């Protein structure tokens, strides 16, 4: 999120690479833990949760880059979202 919302901002690249790293950690856990399906390890559940969160971070970065790179020549600015992000969210 702190990475710039403008060209050169590796937001999606960073998010997907960290997701891949967590997937590698998931592979490591899957090797050390039996294929038994009676329960899911809490460490594995944490890994899955972090992967889901990372995919949501990717989605949010895509949305942010979409909004930032919008132009008045191609998109009509929504008054609700504009007013929210301008005043209502910072002053919330």
């Amino acid at each position: 999120y702190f990475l710039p919302a403008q060209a050169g901002g590796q937001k999606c690249t960073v998010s997907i690479n960290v997701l891949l790293a967590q997937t590698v950690f998931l592979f490591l856990i899957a090797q050390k833990i039996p294929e038994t399906s009676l329960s899911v390890p809490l460490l594995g559940r944490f890994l899955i949760f972090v992967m889901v969160v990372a995919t949501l971070i990717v989605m949010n970065c895509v949305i942010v880059l979409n909004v930032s790179q919008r132009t008045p020549t191609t998109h009509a600015m929504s008054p609700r979202l504009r007013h929210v992000l301008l005043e209502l969210l910072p002053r919330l």
Binding site: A7, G8, G9, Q10, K11, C12, T13, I16, N17, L19, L20, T23, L26, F27, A30, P34, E35, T36, S37, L38, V40, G44, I48, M51, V52, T55, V58, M59, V62, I63, L65, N66, Q69
Partner: protein, 209 residues
């Protein structure tokens, strides 16, 4: 016993062959069997009979990966080409084992769905980000790695294709096509405009929406 009745209960670890059906993996039911019979004594010489219609599962240590949904024993008499005048008896015990999918759901299916979801985000991601191509290529690579994972978990028998594997190949083709069209879009964005392109994308498409 004094009546001459002999009871013998030897332990064994049978490593029997089973045709693993890959289609519904990892939600597959496997039907694995054990064909047991007297090798040299034929049915007119030693007759074997099943103790019960079903295997004795009363001492079965519950497996953490497979659930035995059904078990049954069938006695058969068959004639082999070795021995055409003497049919040989066997009892084929079989077990219908259903896989518990939770481990494979966690470690394969959920990541595959997560990376699949990331495919479509490329079309909302602007060209000016420069992240379109890296995103789609990383999705393609991750999907390829997970296909390589699946191909290791599944026998190379070619009798039938798996359905998760078929879905993975379909998703691979879809991602390849998405990357192709993304390259087309990127080249278009950096580009005299023909009348049909303007009529379709600038006039017709927004008018229909």
């Amino acid at each position: 016993q004094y009546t001459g009745h002999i009871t013998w209960t030897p332990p064994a670890i049978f490593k029997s062959y089973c045709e693993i059906i890959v289609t519904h993996f990892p939600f597959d039911e496997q039907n694995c069997s054990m064909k047991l019979g007297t090798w040299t004594y034929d049915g007119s010489v030693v007759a074997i009979n099943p103790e019960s219609d079903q295997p004795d599962l009363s001492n079965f240590m519950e497996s953490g990966e497979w659930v035995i949904k059904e078990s049954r024993g069938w006695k058969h008499s068959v004639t082999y080409s070795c021995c055409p005048d003497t049919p040989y008896l066997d009892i084929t015990y079989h077990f219908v084992m259903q896989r518990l999918p939770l481990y494979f759901i966690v470690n394969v299916i959920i990541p595959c769905l997560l990376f699949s979801f990331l495919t479509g985000l490329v079309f909302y991601l602007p060209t000016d980000s420069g992240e379109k191509m890296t995103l789609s290529i990383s999705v393609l690579l991750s999907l390829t790695v997970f296909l390589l994972v699946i191909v290791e978990l599944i026998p190379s028998t070619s009798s039938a294709v798996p359905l998760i594997g078929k879905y993975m190949l379909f998703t691979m083709v879809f991602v390849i096509a998405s990357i192709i069209i993304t390259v087309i879009v990127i080249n278009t964005h950096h580009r005299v405009m023909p009348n049909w392109v303007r009529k379709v994308f600038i006039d017709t498409i927004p008018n229909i929406m």
